[PDB]
Amino acid sequence: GQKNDKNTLTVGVMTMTDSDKERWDKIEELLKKENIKLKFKEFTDYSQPNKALKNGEIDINSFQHYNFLNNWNKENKGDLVTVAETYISPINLFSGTENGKAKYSSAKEIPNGGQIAIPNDATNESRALYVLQDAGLIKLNVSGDELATVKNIKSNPKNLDIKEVDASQTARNLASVDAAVVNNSYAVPAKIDFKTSLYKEKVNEGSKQWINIIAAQKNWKKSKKAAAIKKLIKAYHTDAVKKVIKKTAKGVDEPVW
């Protein structure tokens, strides 16, 4: 059956944006030459694909950054591994909206006692708190690779309430809160207007932790899928695919190969 078919790979992804479709189209097209067939399982929530991969419902996934992976392994006693890097996806603080329009043109306009929604998984929660500091809204007593929670807020001059919600729910909150940090995987399908960005995460040598990856089981190299996974990586790391991602996700996803 499929799990023991050397020429089929089942890939776990989030609900596909148009740019996701186009890039996986090109990968598929390139993999015909190798007689590999791709199948996709789409997930709606970040807690799902690593569970599905451990359970062997999928052969690899392509949805997360290194941090999320390491953290997920820890919370779950998992042993999933990184097989390759894909793109980085600098995250934004987006203005809350009223009848669809931005309430604020810059972070400094966020009112005293206002509310900001962020992801509630350790690594994206922390990522978002670092963006708030960069946007000039808060100060943290922790720096660099060190994880942050609300407990690390040592300055909050506008007395903002930080509402920790699921990464999948930050977008939905924008109509109810003053601003939210929203992963692009969610921001694009929610059809958020990116003019409402009040701050875009910066990319430096310290951003390797937010590089997205393809993940597999620890023993994938001894599995029926080893050859197909290697071929998939070669197909992903082409100019053809790099061009597709840059064209269709310029400023959203940036290939790192």
CA atoms within 13 A on the CB side of 253: 30
Helix (H) or strand (E) holding 208: none
Minimum distance, C-beta of residue 210 to ligand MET, in the bound complex (Å): 6
Q: Which residues contact 128 (CB under 8 A, 6 or more apart)?
A: 91, 93, 118, 119, 181
Is 92 one of the binding residues for ligand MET (CB under 6 A)? Answer: no
| Binding to ligand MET, residues 183-202 (CB under 6 A) | 183-185
Helix (H) or strand (E) holding 102: strand 101-102
Nearest-CB residue for ligand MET = 68
For residue 185, give both structure tokens: 């995987």
Is 63 one of the binding residues for ligand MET (CB under 6 A)? Answer: yes
Q: Binder to ligand MET among 12, 30, 43, 68 (CB under 6 A)?
A: 68
Q: Which is nearer to ligand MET, 86 or 217 (CB)?
A: 86
Q: Binder to ligand MET among 65, 225, 231, 242 (CB under 6 A)?
A: 65
> In Å, how far are 130, 143, 152, 201 from 133, measured between CA atoms?
5, 11, 11, 11
Size of interface with ligand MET, in residues (CB under 6 A): 13
Q: Which is nearer to ligand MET, 64 or 170 (CB)?
A: 64
| Whole-angstrom distance, CA of residue 226 vs CA of residue 47 | 25
Minimum distance, C-beta of residue 32 to ligand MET, in the bound complex (Å): 27
| Binding to ligand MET, residues 140-179 (CB under 6 A) | none
Is 23 one of the binding residues for ligand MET (CB under 6 A)? Answer: no
Residue 218 · residue 77 · CB < 8 Å: no
Q: Which of 158, 164, 50, 146 is nearest to 109 (CA)?
A: 158
Q: Binder to ligand MET among 10, 19, 61, 64 (CB under 6 A)?
A: 64
Q: Which is nearer to ligand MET, 152 or 185 (CB)?
A: 185
Which residue's entry shows tokens 């089942």? 10
For residue 111, give both structure tokens: 């009112």
Question: Which one-letter DSSP state was computed for residue 215?
Answer: E
Residues in touch with ligand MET (CB under 6 A): 46, 63-65, 68, 89, 91, 124, 183-185, 210, 212
